[PDB]
Amino acid sequence: TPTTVDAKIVAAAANAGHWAELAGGGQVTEQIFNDRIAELETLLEPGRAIQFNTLFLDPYLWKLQVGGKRLVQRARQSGAPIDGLVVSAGIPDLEEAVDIIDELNEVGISHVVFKPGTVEQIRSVIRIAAEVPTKPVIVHIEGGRAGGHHSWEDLDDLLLATYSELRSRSNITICVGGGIGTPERSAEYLSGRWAEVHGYPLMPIDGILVGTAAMATLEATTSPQVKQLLVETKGTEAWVGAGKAANGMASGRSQLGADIHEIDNAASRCGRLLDEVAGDADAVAERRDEIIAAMAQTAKPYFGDVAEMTYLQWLRRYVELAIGDGNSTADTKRPDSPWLDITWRDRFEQMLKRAEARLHPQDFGPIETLFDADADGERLLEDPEA
Amino acid sequence: WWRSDSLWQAHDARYEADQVCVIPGTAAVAGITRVDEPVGELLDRFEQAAVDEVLGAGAXXXXXXXXXXXXXXXXGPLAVVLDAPDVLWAGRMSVNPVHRIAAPXXXXXXXXXXXXXXXXXXXXXXXXXXXXXXXXXXXXXXXXX
Ligand SMILES: Cc1cc2nc3c(=O)[nH]c(=O)nc-3n(C[C@H](O)[C@H](O)[C@H](O)COP(=O)(O)O)c2cc1C
């Protein structure tokens, strides 16, 4: 999501002659994402091809994917370079998967990508494989030792048990992933020598994915300070259960309750406080002083006392947080950067217009008819202080 | 309010990076040392050292490795036609017509099999393939005359 959302890195990774999946978690519409593919295909040199990643998590995205898949359908009906589709966070049911495989863009899909997290999820994909035996299906088996979206399932035991049934389908391409930064450590899974430690006879793999080790890369959009942070983090051997920051890494749960692997060394303030607040919420009112100050430490600022705070302080706080002085929102608008906050600028307007709405005793003729003009209002907007 | 949309601050932000949720994995972090190392370098580093390990023991300076530095191939012109499912026209990608030419053809003909230069694959759909000017592969389809 953060890493591959940039059209620059996924292009550069592909231009290096490598397979990559464009992130869909950073694209909220067909149009905004169609810009990325267009930026991709422009930065895509002749013939080179890439794939796309999608999430199963929420209904709104799955309804957006109906427009998204038809976008992918339209793109490839137009002959777009994107040669694959990646379903994430869950395995679609047979009728849902058949649809994806059999789409008008099917040949341009050329294979389908699934990411099973459990034994049952693996067995589900096997049934998707037997569905269309002539359709290539790349099964990426991840761990919970991996980054981001998490799981309680071991790296080995899952693949150790399900491998035999996975190889009874020729259309299944087995790909092991997670906790791999190097060719040396990942060489044994390729030779099949990795299963020998568990006594099982050799168990070779068809491919390997690297999520984490590519984050510190040059063409990645990761900030200079964030890269240095990922670097100095020391790594670990097989994941341990004991709750702590483990080798600069501690798990944490998202808003939905699912675990997320985040960096607890580079940033120790957000994760641990979150675990404090989460486990502490009954009595929050009692610890309010301790809790409200810690939000300010991680820069999740509450506002100074709500009543007593002057309307300036309100309106000056939004400008403070929304408008960066270094990036110069006015100068940020000119390149037409995707980082543009314009909803935040629109947010501040609705607050400004509310301020006029609150204090005006008269008919509201002079004030409202001015700031609402395009040419006039937009000029007023690029200069927040004025 | 806390956890929502926390993934974007790691990229292009001047703020203190110790306040941000940034996502590694636990064990993969050990393999992360070099900073601002180009994607092309990391991915090749994987492939190049995987090749060497495979080369040294089993292959021992294989014909495949030697053929590469000397430019020799697998899947020549005749195979490439029957291999790649995608047929490019300009910047657009199309399915290989041979897939629908090979089997569905009533009369299909492969001329001079073992000889590569003279190799020709023709069909009753009136579509024929041959090589011209070295690397250029010539597919010739016809309607009536
Ligand atoms: C920052 C980040 C974002 C990720 N986003 C997604 C995602 O949107 N969908 C998905 O299936 N996996 C996602 N992953 C997981 C990777 O696709 C991959 O499975 C995992 O990172 C591989 O494990 P490793 O990086 O620890 O070696 C993400 C991983 C990271 C580090």
Describe this protein's structure.
The structure is cut from a larger assembly and holds two copies of chain A. Chain A is α/β, with parallel strands linked by helices and 386 residues long. Chain A contains 16 helices and ten strands. Chain A has helices at 7-15, 30-43, 59-77, 94-101, 106-109, 119-129, 155-166, 187-191, 224-232, 269-279, 288-297, 311-322, 329-333, 342-359, 365-371, 374-381; strands at residues 21-22, 51-55, 84-88, 112-114, 137-141, 148-149, 172-177, 207-209, 249-253, 259-263. Helices cover 42% and strands 11% of the residues of chain A. In chain A, the strands form two sheets. A seven-stranded parallel beta sheet of chain A has the order 1-2-3-4-5-7-8. Chain A has a three-stranded antiparallel beta sheet with strand order 6-10-9, covered by helices on one side. Bound molecules: flavin mononucleotide. Chain B: It comes from Mycolicibacterium smegmatis (strain ATCC 700084 / mc(2)155). Chain B: Belongs to the enoyl-CoA hydratase/isomerase family.
